[PDB]
Design a protein around this motif. Structure first.
Motif, PDB file in Angstrom:
ATOM      1  N   UNK C  63       1.543  42.826 -39.029  1.00 49.01           N
ATOM      2  CA  UNK C  63       2.438  43.462 -39.988  1.00 49.01           C
ATOM      3  C   UNK C  63       3.572  44.153 -39.194  1.00 49.01           C
ATOM      4  N   UNK C  65       6.008  46.241 -39.314  1.00 48.12           N
ATOM      5  CA  UNK C  65       6.143  47.704 -39.322  1.00 48.12           C
ATOM      6  C   UNK C  65       5.368  48.327 -40.498  1.00 48.12           C
ATOM      7  N   UNK C  66       4.702  49.485 -40.238  1.00 44.94           N
ATOM      8  CA  UNK C  66       4.063  50.336 -41.268  1.00 44.94           C
ATOM      9  C   UNK C  66       4.971  50.689 -42.458  1.00 44.94           C
ATOM     10  N   UNK C  67       6.214  51.017 -42.152  1.00 40.23           N
ATOM     11  CA  UNK C  67       7.122  51.470 -43.168  1.00 40.23           C
ATOM     12  C   UNK C  67       7.647  50.276 -43.980  1.00 40.23           C
ATOM     13  N   UNK C  68       7.545  49.054 -43.453  1.00 41.84           N
ATOM     14  CA  UNK C  68       8.075  47.895 -44.193  1.00 41.84           C
ATOM     15  C   UNK C  68       6.994  46.937 -44.653  1.00 41.84           C
TER      16      UNK C  68
ATOM     17  N   UNK D 213       3.184  60.184 -38.819  1.00 48.26           N
ATOM     18  CA  UNK D 213       3.102  59.150 -39.846  1.00 48.26           C
ATOM     19  C   UNK D 213       1.959  59.591 -40.692  1.00 48.26           C
TER      20      UNK D 213
ATOM     21  N   UNK E  20      18.268  51.177 -36.747  1.00 46.14           N
ATOM     22  CA  UNK E  20      17.454  50.501 -37.761  1.00 46.14           C
ATOM     23  C   UNK E  20      16.950  51.406 -38.846  1.00 46.14           C
ATOM     24  N   UNK E  22      15.194  53.313 -41.980  1.00 42.36           N
ATOM     25  CA  UNK E  22      13.788  53.425 -42.399  1.00 42.36           C
ATOM     26  C   UNK E  22      13.638  54.548 -43.475  1.00 42.36           C
ATOM     27  N   UNK E  23      12.474  54.645 -44.172  1.00 39.06           N
ATOM     28  CA  UNK E  23      12.150  55.765 -45.079  1.00 39.06           C
ATOM     29  C   UNK E  23      11.652  57.064 -44.399  1.00 39.06           C
TER      30      UNK E  23
ATOM     31  N   UNK I  18       7.079  50.817 -32.824  1.00 35.91           N
ATOM     32  CA  UNK I  18       7.554  49.498 -33.166  1.00 35.91           C
ATOM     33  C   UNK I  18       8.994  49.274 -32.857  1.00 35.91           C
TER      34      UNK I  18
END
Ligand SMILES: [Mg+2]
Ligand SMILES: [Mg+2]
Ligand SMILES: [Zn+2]
Ligand SMILES: [Zn+2]
Ligand SMILES: [Zn+2]
Ligand SMILES: [Zn+2]
Ligand SMILES: [Zn+2]
Lengths: 49, 275, 117, 392, 455, 98, 67, 49, 51, 46, 73
Positions: C63, C65-68, D213, E20, E22-23, I18
């Motif tokens: 996967x 990225x976690x955020x995507x 996170x 890039x 992001x949220x 990432x």
């Protein structure tokens, strides 16, 4: 021990920290006097000694 | 396919709350994915809109709204025929996609009043009430048994609101968890060495590790593979335990069959000639 | 309020496909599937069903990225069998085991247990 | 919670937790602080584990479903206050409904949220686009003879509106008169701050850190009941910092939460704390030094290293990210020198001082250097005489 | 965009990045760029500036873009290397007792970017396919760089072990034609070292391929770590009964030895040391004994550690922390001091009223007999709190002084620069050097070399 | 008004001239938790030069034992100069020696 | 401020067990036994209740429950 | 009358010292609040030793 | 010589495994607020027309 | 239209809806506290 | 340029000229132009005394004097 018995009783009977000082078991010591005392960490050490 | 094994099930124990079972002859990825569905994918009903008419209580409004969403709701008979909000043709809400609750309380008494789950009333028929105190003859019934003290009120405070509960699943918010917890365990004697114990004598033995009863502790076998997973699903109370499992598997079937239809959609629309 | 609405984690967007297939530029009979809005739950299991098959040379997922919300599944098969059919079989077989598991669980419940309802 | 009666207090700024808990492991000194009465944090289930690296270097992986169930949620109150100053000879301030026909202001933000007295009422939601109080300042009375009337002539605007808390609800509105005898108001706004990436948290041993996170219950690693951790702190925070006390506290805490009595942690005794605790925890039924077999959430496989997990009282701090962010495209310009504002509170722009200049020099990026220090803060064109260098 | 932070102490503090989006609202940045910006995500915020034309965007991309900022011209070494968990996770992964089955290898292959496309043959064919850790690390090395050594790990027997049969000992790291042959990777292989794998990569492959190498090492090693796991609890802080007995006995002998030296000193017959007063001779001697006492038990605790001590695993990769920490947590903390001397006599001839006047013993004047794990006794705690201040104060001063020394220095030299005839001249065009650095070479392209002819 | 003024601004005395060293003596009582307040009221301040001084009135003298907090001092520029009173410590109000 | 509906760590509902608990402690000085009878097995669910402080009770006592 | 002296909170001259815990709660004042800080122009102000 | 600049932004940093070595995640709100001037060419014109 | 304005302690409306000075009839207090809007809002239980 | 009591819209006479404080710009609703040399009442702007010692205000280049009681400072 009698002083401690009074502190537990203090929950209803009239008593105070001030009484405890008037018994002369506890004192106030400032930093200048504290230079000349021989202060011991715990009753344990002072007895075991 | 010929290499698909028939796994196997055994129910060890069942209660009004727990369901404890063993799955055998299957893959870990299956066990882990199915454990994840029990949390996230199984749908349920919980309060989702709160409209506050009057609130004189010592708790601020958003706090009332929070406590109130989080309270559990029976859904078993009705969670299926209910449709998802966004999918429903109606503007705002309707009887067909949501169920309505109403709460009205005021402290006119000199003693502090508590606001509870029973005081919350379903405008919808009593097919879907709050969890506690209904058909009862429940030995779980103790003292107040309010299920939740939404707030306390001293003489003069009042609370009037409306709420609309909706169907959704745990991936979207934790109020939709259909589980109190989910135990999962496999290979109790650590045959397969998935963990490596330093001084193995220092570790205790679970109720599943009783096999050699002896203290020999972990005989090795390198030709083995993970088999026979132990579960204990526990109900939050808002949905009975077996129904959680059967709805999880069906939802997983629905999700998979749908991915097959889109993958079919690739071979039908924009003919699969790219690769 | 720079936080995304929670439904977006799982709700499909009208301008995006559920699945996309792209060919590899390096080695033959490899393929790359993109699965949108679907996490490890679907991905981890489809990786395992592909590994179960004896004609799959390579199978994996990531996967990005976690955020995507998106995963990719790359699969490579022998120079005779196509990767799409392997993917089709992998779900269909998975559908078959889960249906049999649901059947076996339900009948197992059908045991004279008295708290079934 | 910082004092009991906060609700009737218009403190200019405040933060309260929804659910505070007293700590599981406590010092006796805390009884006399009444820190039981008004605590400052929650007993987290923490795992000191490495995991997916979103917790590397002074950050933490925090459990999202726990923040859904209200973990560390807080409420935020800002009280804005405004005065009706009489202000001397021939001017006056007035609380009223500003209209673009009758006053000198016309700032772009919406006036409609206001009531007809110039001041909103509790419960209406507000944002950085809203005006909370309509104050106007009558000024010229008419000191511009003959029909320079038209409209908006009588009074200038100067009403107050939200910069900062650019969203929330009005908690309370209070109208009174202060010590001058002027009409005075305090109006309070409530906001609710959910613990998110960028909120700074700290446990009790001086290890502060940001939330790197958040993973939902499904993804955390788990064990037994599956008591998934509410936080994963990195192992590397301990060794060079030797905060061993932090490591004993989970262990003391594990015995205290399980045995069911609040644990002692007073600094100097003969309670042989490392051994005596390890022996008690094992009699109950765990690895005696607290390790548990964890499984990962992504694939369910076991994690080969056993991971030290158990509770620790943690603190959520007053440093929260949405107040701290900032940016500027083009903005207000101060006509002392006419370069961008310094009051960030009023949409400022960050500084680019001599050392940052010195690095662009050290890169040798001259064009970007002239740009930051000229075209992008302060460009100007002047005509000079060729005979003599005066701009006159 | 150009990203910066304050205080900007050198050219590598501000570098180009590509954004890039992001949220959530924080700048999320790569973990490896942590050491060049001296950042910590303990609430340190950083600053970004955007270019407004193609012209400055071109200039940034070529000069100040991060991947080009790898090897600093200050001391021709990497400014940035593999740090923290990944660095610990690399050591743990490269040990040749690590074996991977087909399923996990494919997933790691999957996380790697520039993967060849061909799957390598497992180092063990039967009974079942297994790839060793070195083998999968060896796909991560770009092209074919080469370096022996570049380990100097604790391992073996410095100075005489490699000369004893070269029983491969596996410690020393050897890489050949882009494949890791043997050894274990650590901070000396992977870190900001003069000869690290990372430095050689920049040189041999070129900066773009080196960036892919950093990303690759991290996504792949990191992913493994996730299944393997790492931690530290009270189990990584205790030793056995016998070591614990040995520590107390070493301390009990040393304390008796200090009392013994105090007994000699009061007799008036010690015989002083050269160039020193007799107290200094005495003070130099007790200080030697207490330091030797700490080091002896320190060397005992490092021996006593098991293989599995996660604490030893963090120390050895060189990720974070060190030998002295192990000394302090497991063994005995030792003599505290302030201003380079033992705790002064604050009161009349005494440190605290809890002691006798003039009591030169270890404990009475600031030796901590305990370890952080057993906890400090009350006096030791206050003498430890005194040792705590000297460092906090030192921090606040050094920040002010160095900020001033640096500004004054830049302000002098700023206008010096190498001209197109390559003589280095300042603003009024005076010559500084006839050739820059006396040879006209670049500082980021130099390396340490051995001169054969000094044989 | 005179007491009202000095106590509010934090200045001290004549304002026109006297305010060079004894500045910052009153402060708004911080109220962020319960502890900040108890700790704030029980704070004590040593006056000092400002902006660059390095000496011994910053380290932890032995005589503070039982008197001022071991560790509890601003992590910032004024490290060791604004101190906090220990837990039991007390202060004399003083009276006629007569 | 009143015990939360459902424990943070896992989900098991817990506000319902508060009123019951004050009754048990009044009856018996057995915090171990009290938590056990309520069914709070695992300790996350236990810390919830064991470590709560019911501030609401002091808070309600102000007369002006009217503003 | 010569002037107005700022009282410090809950000291012997500020009316809060005499009332009991129920009374103090009746005055919307916290029982645990420590006092010993002046109130000026709305702002609570503490003097640093 | 030490000017306040436009097109500047500041937030907290948090780690992200990432990103590539030279990528930076930028909050969507900051990305919406700060602008770049592209000049219209007869190639991107259709793309810029969409924007 | 009225502007309510409940007063402190008396627990009754202040009846003031004009420019006249603020002071609650009967009750000696002179602090006000503008009443809640009848306008509906909404709150998500998320 | 003396005819600018806030009017300079090229195509049509002005009806309104709203102040978009946040952008630092002057906007004309029924079209789209931007005419601005922006100031937000110079009195908020000079007010860059803040984190530095503000109790004494070294930045105060402007005393109040209170002229509306008097006339001649
Ligand atoms: Mg830092
Ligand atoms: Mg760092
Ligand atoms: Zn509907
Ligand atoms: Zn001229
Ligand atoms: Zn729980
Ligand atoms: Zn009244
Ligand atoms: Zn126009």
């Amino acid at each position: 021990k009698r002083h401690i018995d009074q502190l537990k009783e203090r929950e209803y009977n009239n008593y105070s920290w001030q009484d405890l000082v008037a018994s002369g078991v506890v004192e106030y010591i400032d930093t200048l006097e504290e230079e000349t005392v021989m202060l011991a960490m715990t009753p344990d050490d002072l007895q075991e000694k | 396919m010929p290499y698909a094994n028939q796994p196997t099930v055994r129910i060890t124990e069942l209660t009004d709350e727990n369901v404890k079972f063993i799955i055998e002859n299957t893959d870990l990825a299956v066990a882990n994915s199915i454990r994840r569905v029990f949390i996230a994918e199984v749908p349920i009903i919980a309060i989702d809109w709160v409209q506050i008419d009057a609130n004189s209580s010592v708790l601020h409004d958003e706090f009332i709204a929070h406590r109130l969403g989080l309270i559990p709701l029976i859904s078993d008979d009705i969670v299926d025929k209910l449709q998802y909000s966004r999918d429903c043709t109606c503007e705002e809400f309707c009887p067909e996609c949501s169920v309505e609750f109403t709460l009205d309380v005021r402290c006119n008494e000199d003693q502090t009043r508590h606001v509870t789950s029973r005081d919350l009333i379903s405008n919808s028929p009593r097919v879907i009430p709050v969890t506690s105190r209904n058909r009862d003859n429940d030995p779980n019934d103790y003292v107040e048994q309010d299920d939740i003290l939404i707030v306390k009120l001293r003489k003069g405070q009042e609370l009037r609101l409306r709420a609309y509960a909706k169907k959704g699943f745990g991936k979207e918010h934790a109020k939709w968890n259909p589980t109190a917890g989910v135990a999962f365990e496999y290979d109790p004697d650590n045959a397969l060495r998935h963990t490596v114990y330093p001084k193995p004598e220092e570790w205790p033995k679970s109720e599943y590790s009783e096999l050699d009863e002896d203290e020999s502790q972990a005989p090795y076998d390198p030709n083995g593979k993970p088999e026979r997973f132990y579960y204990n699903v526990e109900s939050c109370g808002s949905l009975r335990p077996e129904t959680i499992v059967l709805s999880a598997l069906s939802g997983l079937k629905k999700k998979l069959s749908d991915l097959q239809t889109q993958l079919s959609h690739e071979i039908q629309s924009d003919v699969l000639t790219i690769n | 309020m720079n936080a995304p609405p929670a439904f977006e984690s799982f709700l499909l967007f009208e301008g995006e496909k559920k699945i996309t297939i792209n060919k590899d530029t390096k080695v033959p009979n490899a393929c790359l599937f993109t699965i949108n809005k679907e996490d490890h739950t679907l991905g981890n299991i489809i990786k395992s069903q592909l590994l179960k098959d004896p004609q799959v040379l390579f199978a994996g997922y990531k996967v990005p990225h976690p955020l995507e919300h998106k995963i990719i599944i790359r699969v490579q098969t022998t120079p005779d069998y196509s990767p799409q059919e392997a993917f089709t079989n992998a779900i269909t077989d998975l559908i078959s085991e889960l249906s049999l598991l649901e059947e076996r669980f339900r009948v197992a419940i059908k045991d004279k247990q008295e708290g079934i309802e | 919670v910082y004092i009991t009666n906060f609700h009737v207090r218009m403190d200019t700024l405040a933060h309260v937790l929804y659910y505070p808990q007293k700590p599981l492991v406590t010092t006796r000194s805390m009884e006399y602080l009444r820190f039981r009465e008004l605590p400052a944090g929650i007993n987290s289930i923490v795992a000191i584990a490495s995991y997916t690296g979103y917790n590397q270097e002074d950050s933490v992986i925090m459990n999202r479903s726990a923040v859904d169930r209200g973990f560390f949620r807080s409420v935020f109150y800002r009280s804005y206050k405004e005065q009706e100053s009489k202000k001397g000879f021939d001017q006056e301030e007035v609380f009223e409904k500003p209209t673009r026909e009758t006053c000198q202001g016309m700032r772009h933000a919406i006036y409609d949220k206001l009531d007809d007295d110039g001041l909103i009422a509790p419960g209406v939601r507000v944002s950085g686009d809203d005006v909370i109080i309509g104050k106007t300042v009558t000024l010229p009375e008419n000191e511009d003879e003959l029909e320079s009337t038209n409209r908006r002539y009588t009074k200038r605007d100067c009403s107050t509106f939200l910069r900062t808390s650019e969203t929330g609800i009005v908690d309370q509105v209070m109208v009174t008169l202060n010590q001058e005898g002027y009409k005075f108001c305090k109006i309070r706004v409530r906001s609710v701050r959910i613990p998110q990436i960028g909120d700074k948290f700290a446990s009790r041993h001086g290890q502060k850190g940001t939330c790197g996170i958040q993973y939902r219950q499904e993804d955390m690693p788990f064990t037994c009941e599956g008591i998934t951790p509410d936080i994963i702190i990195n192992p590397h925070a301990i060794p060079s910092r030797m905060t061993i006390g932090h490591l004993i506290e989970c262990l003391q805490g594990k015995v205290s939460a399980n045995k069911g009595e609040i644990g002692d942690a007073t600094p100097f005794n003969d309670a042989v704390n490392v051994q005596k605790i390890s022996n008690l925890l094992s009699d109950y039924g765990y690895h005696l030094r607290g390790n548990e077999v964890l499984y990962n959430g992504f694939t369910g496989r076991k994690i080969t290293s056993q991971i030290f997990i158990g509770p620790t009282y943690y603190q959520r701090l007053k440093h929260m990210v949405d107040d701290k962010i900032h940016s500027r495209a083009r903005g207000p310009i101060q006509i002392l020198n006419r370069q961008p504002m310094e009051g960030r509170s009023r949409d400022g722009g960050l500084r680019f001082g001599e050392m940052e200049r010195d690095c662009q020099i050290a890169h040798g990026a001259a064009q970007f250097l002239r740009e930051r220090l000229f075209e992008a803060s302060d460009p100007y064109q002047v005509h000079v005489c060729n005979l003599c260098g005066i701009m006159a | 965009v150009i990203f910066n932070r304050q205080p900007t102490l050198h050219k590598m503090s501000m570098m180009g990045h590509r954004v890039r989006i992001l949220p959530w609202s924080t700048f999320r940045l790569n973990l490896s760029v942590t050491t060049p910006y001296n950042a910590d995500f303990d609430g340190d915020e950083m600053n970004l500036h955007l270019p407004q034309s193609l012209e400055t965007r071109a200039e940034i991309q070529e000069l100040a873009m991060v991947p080009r900022m790898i090897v600093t011209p200050q001391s021709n070494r990497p400014v940035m290397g593999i740090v923290q968990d990944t660095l610990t996770a690399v050591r743990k992964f490269t040990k040749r007792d690590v074996f991977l089955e087909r399923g996990e290898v494919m997933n790691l292959l999957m996380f790697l970017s520039t993967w060849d496309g061909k799957v390598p043959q497992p180092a063990i064919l039967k009974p079942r396919p297994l790839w060793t850790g070195k083998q999968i690390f060896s796909l991560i090395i770009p092209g074919h760089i080469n370096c022996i050594r570049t380990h100097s790990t604790h391992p073996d027997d410095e100075d005489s072990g490699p000369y004893k049969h070269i029983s491969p000992g596996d410690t020393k790291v050897v890489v050949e034609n882009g494949e890791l042959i043997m050894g274990i990777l650590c901070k000396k292989s992977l870190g900001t070292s003069a000869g690290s794998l990372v430095h050689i990569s920049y040189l041999e492959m070129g900066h773009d391929i080196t960036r892919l190498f950093y990303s690759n090492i991290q996504t792949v090693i990191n992913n493994w770590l996730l299944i393997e796991g790492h931690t530290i609890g009270i189990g990584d802080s205790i030793a056995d009964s016998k070591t614990y007995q040995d520590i107390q006995n070493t301390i009990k002998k040393a304390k008796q030895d200090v009392i013994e030296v105090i007994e000699k000193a009061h007799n008036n017959e010690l015989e002083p040391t050269p160039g020193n007063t007799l107290r200094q001779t005495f003070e130099n001697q007790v200080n030697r004994i207490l330091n030797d006492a700490r080091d002896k038990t320190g060397s005992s605790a490092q021996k006593s550690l098991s293989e599995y001590n996660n604490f030893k695993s963090m120390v050895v990769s060189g990720a974070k922390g060190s030998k002295i920490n192990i000394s302090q947590v497991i063994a005995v903390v030792g003599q505290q001091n302030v201003e380079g001397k033992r705790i002064p006599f604050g009161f009349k001839h005494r440190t605290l009223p809890h002691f006798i006047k003039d009591d030169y013993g270890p404990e009475s004047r600031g030796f901590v007999e305990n370890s952080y794990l057993a906890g400090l006794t009350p006096t030791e705690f206050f003498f430890h709190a005194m040792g705590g201040r000297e460092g906090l104060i030192d921090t606040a001063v050094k920040t002010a002084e160095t900020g001033y020394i640096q500004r004054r220095l830049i302000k002098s030299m700023e206008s010096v620069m190498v001209k197109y005839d390559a003589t280095v001249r300042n603003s009024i065009n005076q010559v500084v050097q006839l050739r820059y650095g006396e040879d006209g070479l670049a500082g980021e392209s130099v390396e340490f070399q051995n001169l054969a002819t000094l044989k | 008004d005179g007491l009202k003024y000095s106590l509010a601004t934090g200045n001290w005395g004549d304002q026109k001239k006297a305010h060079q060293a004894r500045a910052g003596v009153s402060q708004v009582l911080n109220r962020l938790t319960f502890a900040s307040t108890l700790s704030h009221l029980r704070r004590l301040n040593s006056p000092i030069g400002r902006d660059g001084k390095l000496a011994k009135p910053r380290q932890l003298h032995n005589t503070l034992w039982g008197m001022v907090c071991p560790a509890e001092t601003p992590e910032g520029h004024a490290v060791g100069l604004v101190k906090n009173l220990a837990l039991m410590a007390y202060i004399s109000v003083g009276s006629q020696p007569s | 401020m009143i015990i939360p509906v459902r424990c943070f760590t896992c989900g098991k509902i817990v506000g319902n067990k508060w009123e019951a608990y004050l009754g048990l402690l009044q009856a018996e000085y057995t915090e171990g036994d009290a938590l056990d009878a309520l069914g709070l097995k695992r300790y996350c669910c236990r810390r919830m209740l064991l470590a709560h402080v019911d501030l609401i009770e002091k808070l309600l006592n102000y007369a002006p429950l009217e503003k | 009358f010569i002037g107005k002296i700022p009282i410090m909170l809950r000291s012997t001259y500020c009316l809060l010292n005499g009332l009991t815990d129920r009374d103090l709660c009746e005055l919307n004042e916290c029982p645990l609040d420590p006092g010993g800080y002046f109130i000026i122009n709305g702002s609570e102000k503490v003097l640093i030793a | 010589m030490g000017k306040r600049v436009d097109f500047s932004a500041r937030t907290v940093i948090t780690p992200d495994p990432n990103l590539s070595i030279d990528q930076v995640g930028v909050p969507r709100s900051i990305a919406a607020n700060m602008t770049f001037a592209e000049i219209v060419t007869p190639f991107n014109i259709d793309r810029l027309q969409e924007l | 239209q009225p502007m309510i304005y409940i007063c402190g302690e008396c627990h009754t409306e202040n009846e003031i809806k004009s420019r006249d000075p603020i002071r609650c009839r009967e009750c000696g207090y002179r602090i006000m506290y503008k009443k809640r809007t009848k306008r509906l809002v909404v709150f998500d239980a998320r | 340029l003396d005819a600018l009591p806030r009017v300079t819209c090229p195509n049509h006479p002005d009806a309104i000229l709203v102040e978009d404080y946040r952008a630092g710009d002057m906007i004309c609703p029924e079209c789209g132009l931007v005419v601005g040399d922006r100031v937000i009442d110079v009195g908020s702007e000079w007010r860059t005394f803040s984190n530095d010692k503000a109790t004494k205000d070294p930045s105060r280049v402007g005393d109040s004097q209170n002229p509306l009681l008097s006339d001649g400072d």
